[PDB]
Every structure is written in structure tokens, then in C-alpha cells.
């Protein structure tokens, strides 16, 4: 179960809900995964025309994604996620046994 | 001169414990003495790299390169022609245009590795795709390193 987004508050709240539900269901859960940040940066020129001092500006997009694992029913985990997840976050599922 | 007072307890169980710079020269000397490999005569008119632009002007550069290759095989046992070219990359001057890095010629390295494979010092396998040292070669190079260590110590 890996989640991905661009802002940190959404991933924080949904991961909080995820491990709260994990503690509720007292199931085999792997530790949290805290990946290094991945940034998308482009630099573009201002001044739509060709006149004036050459001035540029830079951008940044910090993409945030983490991983977790749970030993539970796929249907029940997908329901408990889809109940309390914001569609702005993308989540995928991988099951574990031992 | 090159020796220094060692302040810790060594192991000297393999070849990395000995200095590489002199170990490759010692292996080149042994290679010339025993004539394990050929020259080969086929490469005596080709520069090592595009940006080298000059002849090696030593007559033993094949032995030097082979000693270097074996040092590489031991130090990192998963190599390739691309990795070797990258490590052997040197500068190349384009005249007026600025100098750029450039890789070495691949045929010389391919010939060297084929010669080593024929000698059996290095082998190939799907698992561990890169060139690896055999067990017999491992023990032989271990004893060679110990011999060089004893020679340069006592």
C-alpha cells in the first residue's frame, strides 16, 4: 500500500488514519517508509517580448510518496481507504503474508 | 621510501592490502617473464583512445593495461566494456571548440578480456553478468599478493 501526492498535509492525515485503523484491526503491519523528497524544477524566461534585462525564474514541485504493508482483506482495506481518502491522493495495494 | 610505519594490525589476506600501483608493475613483470599472453601484434598501430592522439610510446602498454584490468576485476568484480571505457576515459581536444571527456577504444579492452578469458583468469556467467575471477585465479592472486607483500616487507 503506497500513496503519492504533492502536498504533505494530505499524506500526513491519510497515513495517520491508516495506522490508526491498523492499530484498531490489530493486524500484521510493516513499518512506515519515509522516502527522500523528489523535486521537479524548471526555469523559464520572463518578459514575453525580446526587450529588457534577461530575467529568468525557477519553479519547484516536491512530490511526496510513502509505502506501508498490511495483512488484511483486499476488499476491506480498499473500502476503509476509499471511505476516508481525498481523490487527490493516489494509492496502490500490495498484500503480505508473513 | 614508499613504505610507512603501520600503526595498526594488518591482515594481508588478499591483494587489496598490497599497494595497487606496484602490484600491477610486479604482475606486468611476471607476465613478460612467463609470456602468458601475446602482445598482440594486431594492435601495435592503434591509439588507446580517440582523445589520446598520441602513441603510448612504451612498448609494454598492453601488459600495463592487462595488469590494470586484473586490478579492476579484483577491486570490483562486476565490470563491463562500458564501465571499463568510462574508467579509462580521458580528455579530447576539438581544436577551437572546448575540450570534452571521451571514452577509450573498445576493441583493445575486448581483446584484453578475451585473452584473459582464454588464460582462464576471468570467466563469464549469466548471474553476476560482469566479468568475475575464478576460484583458482582467486587463490593464485592471493598467493601472488602474499608473495609480493613478503618480497617488499622482508
Amino acid at each position: 500500500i503506497a500513496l503519492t501526492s504533492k502536498n504533505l498535509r494530505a499524506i500526513e492525515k491519510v497515513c495517520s488514519d491508516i495506522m490508526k485503523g491498523a492499530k484498531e484491526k490489530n493486524l500484521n503491519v510493516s513499518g512506515p517508509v519515509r522516502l527522500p523528497v523528489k523535486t521537479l524544477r524548471i526555469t523559464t524566461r520572463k518578459s514575453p517580448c525580446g526587450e529588457g534585462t534577461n530575467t529568468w525564474d525557477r519553479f519547484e514541485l516536491r512530490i511526496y510518496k510513502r509505502l506501508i504493508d498490511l495483512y488484511s482483506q483486499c476488499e476491506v482495506v480498499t473500502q476503509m481507504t476509499s471511505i476516508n481518502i481525498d481523490p487527490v491522493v493516489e494509492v496502490e495495494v500490495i498484500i503480505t503474508d508473513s | 621510501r614508499l613504505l610507512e610505519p603501520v600503526p595498526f594490525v594488518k591482515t594481508n589476506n588478499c591483494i587489496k592490502d598490497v599497494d595497487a600501483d606496484l602490484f600491477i608493475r610486479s604482475y606486468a613483470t611476471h607476465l613478460k617473464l612467463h609470456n602468458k599472453i601475446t602482445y598482440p601484434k594486431w594492435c601495435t598501430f592503434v591509439k588507446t583512445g580517440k582523445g589520446r592522439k598520441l602513441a603510448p610510446l612504451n612498448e609494454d602498454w598492453y601488459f600495463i593495461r592487462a595488469s590494470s584490468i586484473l586490478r579492476r576485476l579484483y577491486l570490483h568484480p562486476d565490470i563491463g566494456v562500458g564501465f571499463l571505457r568510462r574508467q579509462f576515459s580521458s580528455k579530447q581536444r576539438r581544436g577551437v571548440a572546448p575540450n570534452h571527456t571521451s571514452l577509450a577504444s573498445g576493441k583493445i579492452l575486448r581483446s584484453i578480456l578475451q585473452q584473459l578469458e582464454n588464460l582462464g583468469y576471468v570467466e563469464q556467467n549469466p548471474k553476476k553478468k560482469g566479468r568475475r575471477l575464478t576460484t583458482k585465479g582467486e587463490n593464485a592472486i592471493n598467493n601472488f599478493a602474499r608473495y609480493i607483500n613478503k618480497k617488499v616487507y622482508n
Partner: protein
Amino acid sequence: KRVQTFGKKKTAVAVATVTNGKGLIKLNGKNLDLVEPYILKTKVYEPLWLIGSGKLKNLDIRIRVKGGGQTSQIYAIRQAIGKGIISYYQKYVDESTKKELKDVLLRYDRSLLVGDTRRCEPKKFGGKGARARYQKSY
């Protein structure tokens, strides 16, 4: 018995692990001697004279050195070995000598214990130079 420590300074990060042994000190597959720079070899050696080889004769410290420039690696390994030896003194072998150990390390310098935060700044606008720009033509 065994404890792991780290040294972070400049671009390079070095890690050490001091265990019980007979004085086996290793740098990756190599040792502290085959780095190349005999100038920085003694820089790494300075803790050996500051503390003592007879006590290193009873401790084995493995070291992994990886990334960054050669000077940064030397400085990082110095930091890592200093922190590892101070931790091993605080934990296993003895503390009373550790009291003088800190007193001697800090007497020599503050650089061995803690690295520096000196790093490159984001190169600015205007031209090739960080603080310099293209030549002005009127």
C-alpha cells in the same frame, strides 16, 4: 562489544563500527594506508598519537568510506573514528580515561569531534560567475 558511529562533514560521509578485537582497522576492502595521500594519512593518524596505539591494540574498528572528495573523506573518517572511540570509551572499556580523552581531543582542536557545515551555495543569475555576470557593453 560492538557500537556503530558516523562522521558527516563536507560532501563525504564516513561510518565506523568499533568492536572487540586485536587492532584490525579496515577502510572498505583497503586499509588506512592505501588511500594515496600520505599528507592526509597523518591527519587521520593524529588521534592515534593523541590517544594511544596500545589501547587500539585491543579494539577492532571497521570503517566504510563512500562518496565525496578525498579531503572530505579523510575529514569524515576522522570524525567517525573520533566519535566511535568516544562512544566505546563511554560504554565498554573505561570512562576515567575518557575524561582526559575529551580534554586532549578538544585541546588539539574542535575539528576532530564535529565537522563543518561549509558547503556550496546555489549559483546565482546574471552570468557564468556565482557573484559575477557577463561583461557589460555600452
